[PDB]
Symmetry: C3
């Protein structure tokens, strides 16, 4: 049940939430360009996951807390269904986040 | 007059500047895609602010210094006029920068 | 032969590789949007270099290791031929990476 796969500090940040339904912790997040808010990462593009949710949401919150850095265990993250294995590997590329198999 | 709202190290970087007028410190920056240079963040998109200016510019400089990490106090940053509250909250999402209300 | 130009920790990450030919260490990387894999940064856009290769590749590897943070010496990096001086200066803007002249 280990969440990290590396020792680099895992810093958190807050942001405006566009999530409108319950969402578990360790969900990757992306920006919604129409609103500028953070929503669940849809898996469509590598590099567009900009955060990993820290606290579960109920879907009513205007703000959320996310990890903006750290190295996560791949298996701990709640990935979107259907995600492409390469886009999953490189979900966070370009941010300070990364992930790796423990395994 | 506190500039930071968190303890994560605030690292700086240098970059090529496209700014041609005086600009105060703690201004968010974006890339200009036509030139590749750093300019003032226009507020149009969340996640496109890639830096926060460290030293004031006069507008003649070919290079600038910017913060590439850290957690800033929202009120300390010199935001662009008109900015959308959500795009402002998520200005830096995807970078190692973030900001929060002290308040 | 110094590779770093600053003291901020240089963290590494792994990612899915789309590189199919030998590639030296300290090569900047970008995402290929069609596949989601990491490939050599082509120099076309500032901010699209998301990593710097840590280990040389032979071109057969499905995964690679890259730096996701740190301040590099400009001269140590293996830049793409033809790169624009401004796009080169700002190659990594928006990531936790940066570079500077030692010189």
């Amino acid at each position: 049940v280990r969440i990290f796969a590396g020792n680099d500090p895992a810093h958190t940040a807050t942001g405006s939430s566009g999530i409108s339904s319950p969402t578990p912790a360790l969900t990757p997040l992306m920006l919604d360009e129409a609103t500028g808010k953070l929503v669940v990462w849809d898996g469509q593009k590598a590099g567009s996951a900009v955060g990993i949710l820290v606290l579960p949401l109920e879907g009513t919150e205007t703000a959320l807390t996310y990890y903006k850095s750290g190295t996560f265990a791949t298996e701990a993250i709640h990935w979107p269904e259907x995600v492409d294995e390469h886009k999953k590997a490189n979900a966070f590329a370009g941010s300070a986040l990364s992930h790796a198999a423990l395994p």
